[PDB]
Write a protein that binds this ligand. Structure first.
Ligand SMILES: [Mg+2]
Lengths: 49, 185, 193, 141, 124, 57
RNA sequence: GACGGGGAAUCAGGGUUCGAUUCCGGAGAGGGAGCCUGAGAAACGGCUACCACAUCCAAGGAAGGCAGCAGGCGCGCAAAUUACCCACUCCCGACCCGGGGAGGUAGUGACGAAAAAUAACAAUACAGGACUCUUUCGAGGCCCUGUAAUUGGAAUGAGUCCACUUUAAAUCCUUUAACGAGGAUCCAUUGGAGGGCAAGUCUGGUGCCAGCAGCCGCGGUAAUUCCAGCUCCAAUAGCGUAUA
């Protein structure tokens, strides 16, 4: 038959990469719009301020 | 101060001449005749035969009518009778040194499987042992370098789990049966 | 703690394993000496410290990834290498010059930018205390144009044996915790030379 | 043996000690001056970084130049000259870069047509020259 | 089928239990669980099935024999007096504390760090 | 010619021929079987001197 | 470049080298010095001052010695988990019941040691060995030996993965399910091919250049030694190199 590539190690990581992509995208699907994280405060200024 | 073994030894020796014609021809003849894998096996058989010959020579150089000479000599003769490389006619200490690598090589389990008629070739005997088909005194053996004793020769038969001697058929039989069921509908 | 992490560095990405989560007290900051706590799990929006075993080289300001799977072969980080190939503002030009040393990455970046605007190449970018090896590489650079045969150490203390092997043969170390005082000492030595 | 007497063993032992001392290999292996003059300090391998790449010719019968490299050792700062082993490997080695240098195989002596040099480079920048030769691994940069 | 031949039987009046070695002969089957061999020792040695404790089962090469230990006490509470507690935890007659060693060691050191009544309250 | 201090001229001027696909070689125990067969089984008696296993003259 | 011994490697007979290292005895806890308690200590996970080094501080003072178990830096050619348990072997205490980084368990682990997969069988394909005959043509091939990418069913193992077993809790071994191969791609490397020393006067490129070579030596526009393809030789999950 002819379904995958000529080797096996080349196609071994593709299933893992697409599983990582789908589990990332699902992690962007069910999100919470209430009780969020904390913002980041960024303090800037000049010398001797 | 951990409690371990820390006891090991090397069972084979390497000759000082790596490239000679007659030596390589002799080990190649032995390996191809008796179906062995590499020269480490015949090197280890040479090593244990040299150890037995050295022990017999050390007993022969000690004087006659001494209890240690008789004890270790009769122990060595009873042991080598139990292996089967000697008979009761040649039950003598000086007859130990007239042995050969051939006599130690006939007592291999692979040679006995090929010789009795379980297998068709010596390599087929080796791969038949490797797939767990040969048992002796109700215990399966998966290794070809098994030394059978003289009393253990008549117990050689096929296993109760191998399909060759009666049991569950293997992977290709059930797959071909399922293929026949699929073809028949 | 039971995970495999990847952090980018000087020689591409370096894969390591996490060891401890050192957290400062909430009343205090990260710049405290020898007073932290150990945790198994850390919650989001927190400033934590990661401990590793063999990383030694890390370009900060870059993402990291955590894999729950078995990462048996580095092919999974092709997108990280692709991200590293773009936005390289701090190009690590490795030439033959002054062996410079600093305690932090930002101090090292500021010092190499000062050498860049001072039009002097730099050789070594080691981070940490000054040892015998850095002074020895300065002694190597004491041949083949010995002008750049000094060790620039900022906000760090040197070892005593390094000082002894330094002044046994004449290697100058301008160790100063004040960066503009270090600049003035360096340009004074340059003018004297 | 010459002095063969039943109560003569100290004379034989002392004479054997003196004649064993008056040797070459035993005198080299049991005096500290050889190891003090040894650049490696009695070790198989040593590290170092590259000063420059130079070139030296062969002896009278063989006509070629052999491209060694000048590396000083890290243990004690001895400046030695090490021969870059195989063909085209001078591109892989760079100035001011760490190398791993071992001997060439004659217990600290020159081998064949190369003059005076007795060391060879095995690894550069903690990657082997064999991997850079056979196309099995690429050097970092 | 599977059949049992006990080996190396002895009694122990010093500790009110019976030592023997049980070899399990199961041609064609897998390794027997300890509960079912406890029921076999119950129906063989005419005692209650909750007093017998079995352990140490080791299979042989080829899968025809499995030898191991097994103990029969005269009564249940006589077994509860003289036995390791982890075997009773295996057989569900005992419960143990689930506290790790580092937490206990840290609590002991923090109790050592203070004196008085506050020792019993600093460690929760 | 170009220069003499250039390195790897022969390696940099070698006509790069890729390897061709061949059947895999038997290894382990069967290679000893084939060597024993080809050296001691199908040999013909020969006079004079014995040629080598690669004497393609 | 000395802790000592029981011992290790090689070894005809004699010897040579090593022994920091699990058992025995001795010495020290940065290095000298002094001491309380106690049966037993000049104890350092006890104390007191010196110097080397070093921590915190409101600057008045206060607190220490991983050549213990993990871990980090330096030094380097060179050496691992900032894990689980007192279940096993014993030890201390008022003692069946508490404690033990003494230990045991697993992880890392090509220092090293033992066993052992990467194939076997059957039929036409094509070269011959055994048997008288056809001097030479060719035939029983009923008895074979081999191998060329012809084919066929029979096999089991790595691995995935219910259970059972082990164990203080696990992991691994063994048992056992359901799946798991014909270019069985589920594809074996490391060196070498002038002599020593087993194995091409094969084919192309450079032309005392690049380089090979432990030693003789090979390279000068026909290289049995350089650089590449094919074939072949050596040992085989192992092989090459540098040092004592
Ligand atoms: Mg300011």
């Amino acid at each position: 038959d002819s379904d995958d590539d000529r080797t096996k190690e080349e196609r071994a990581y593709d299933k893992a990469k697409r599983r990582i992509e789908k589990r990332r995208l699902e992690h962007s699907k069910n999100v919470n719009t209430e009780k969020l994280r904390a913002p980041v405060i960024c303090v800037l200024g000049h010398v001797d301020t | 101060p951990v409690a371990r073994s820390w006891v090991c030894r090397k069972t084979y020796v390497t000759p000082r001449r790596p490239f000679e014609k007659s030596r390589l021809d002799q080990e190649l003849k032995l390996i191809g005749e008796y179906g062995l894998r590499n020269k480490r096996e015949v090197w280890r058989v040479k090593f244990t035969l040299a150890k037995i010959r050295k022990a017999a020579r050390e007993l022969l150089t000690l004087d006659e009518k001494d209890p240690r000479r008789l004890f270790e000599g009769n122990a060595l003769l009873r042991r080598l009778v139990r292996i089967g490389v000697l008979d009761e006619g040649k039950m003598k200490l000086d007859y130990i040194l007239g042995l050969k690598i051939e006599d130690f090589l006939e007592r291999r389990l692979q040679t006995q499987v090929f010789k009795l008629g379980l297998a068709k070739s010596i390599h087929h005997a080796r791969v038949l042992i490797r797939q767990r088909h040969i048992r002796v005194r109700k215990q399966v053996v998966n290794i070809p370098s098994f030394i059978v004793r003289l009393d253990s020769q008549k117990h050689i038969d096929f296993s109760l789990r191998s399909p060759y001697g009666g049991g569950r058929p293997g992977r290709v039989k059930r797959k071909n049966a399922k293929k026949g069921q699929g073809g028949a509908g | 703690e039971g995970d495999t992490i990847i952090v980018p560095g000087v020689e591409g990405p370096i894969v390591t394993q996490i060891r401890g989560l050192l957290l400062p007290p909430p009343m205090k900051e990260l710049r405290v000496k020898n007073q932290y706590e150990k945790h198994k799990e850390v919650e989001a929006a927190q400033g934590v410290k990661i401990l590793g075993k063999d990383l030694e080289k890390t370009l900060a300001g870059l993402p990291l990834l955590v894999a729950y799977k078995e990462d048996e072969i580095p092919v999974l980080k092709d997108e990280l290498i692709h991200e590293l190939k773009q936005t390289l503002n701090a190009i690590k030009l490795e030439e033959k010059g002054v062996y410079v040393q600093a305690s932090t990455l930002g101090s090292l970046e500021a010092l190499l930018e000062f050498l860049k605007t001072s039009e002097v190449p730099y050789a070594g970018i080691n981070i940490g205390p000054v040892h015998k090896k850095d002074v020895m590489k300065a002694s190597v650079m004491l041949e083949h144009d010995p002008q750049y045969a000094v060790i620039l150490a900022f906000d760090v203390r040197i070892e005593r044996d390094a000082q002894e092997m330094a002044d046994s043969l004449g290697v100058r170390i301008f160790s100063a915790e004040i960066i503009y005082h270090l600049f003035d000492a360096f340009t004074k030595y340059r003018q004297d030379y | 043996g010459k002095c063969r007497g039943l109560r003569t063993a100290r004379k034989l032992r002392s004479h054997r000690r003196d004649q064993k001392w008056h040797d070459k290999q035993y005198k080299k292996a049991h005096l500290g001056t050889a190891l003090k003059a040894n650049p490696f300090g009695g070790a198989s391998h040593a590290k170092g970084i590259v000063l420059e790449k130079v070139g030296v010719e062969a002896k009278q019968p063989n006509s070629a130049i052999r491209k060694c490299v000048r590396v000083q050792l890290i243990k004690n700062g001895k400046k030695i000259t090490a021969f870059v082993p195989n063909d085209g490997c001078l591109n892989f080695i760079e100035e001011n870069d760490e190398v791993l240098v071992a001997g060439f195989g004659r217990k600290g002596h020159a081998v064949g047509d190369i003059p005076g040099v007795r060391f060879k480079v095995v690894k550069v920048a903690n990657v082997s020259l064999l991997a850079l030769y056979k196309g099995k691994k690429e050097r970092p940069r | 089928t599977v059949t049992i031949r006990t080996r190396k039987f002895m009694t122990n009046r010093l500790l009110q239990r019976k030592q023997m070695v049980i070899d399990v002969l199961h041609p064609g089957k897998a390794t027997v669980p300890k509960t079912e061999i406890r029921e076999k020792l119950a129906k063989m040695y005419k005692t209650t099935p909750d007093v017998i404790f079995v352990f140490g089962f080791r299979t042989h090469f080829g899968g025809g024999k499995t030898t191991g230990f097994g103990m029969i006490y005269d009564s249940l509470d006589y077994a509860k007096k003289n036995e390791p507690k982890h075997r009773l935890a295996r057989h569900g007659l005992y419960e143990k504390k689930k506290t790790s060693r580092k937490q206990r060691k840290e609590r002991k050191n923090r109790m050592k760090k203070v004196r008085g009544t506050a020792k019993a309250n600093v460690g929760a | 010619h170009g220069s003499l201090a250039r390195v790897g001229k022969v390696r940099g001027q070698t006509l790069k021929v890729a390897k061709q696909e061949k059947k895999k070689k038997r290894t382990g125990r069967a290679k000893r079987r084939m060597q024993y067969n080809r050296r001691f089984v199908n040999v013909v008696p020969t006079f004079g001197k014995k040629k080598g296993p690669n004497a393609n003259s």
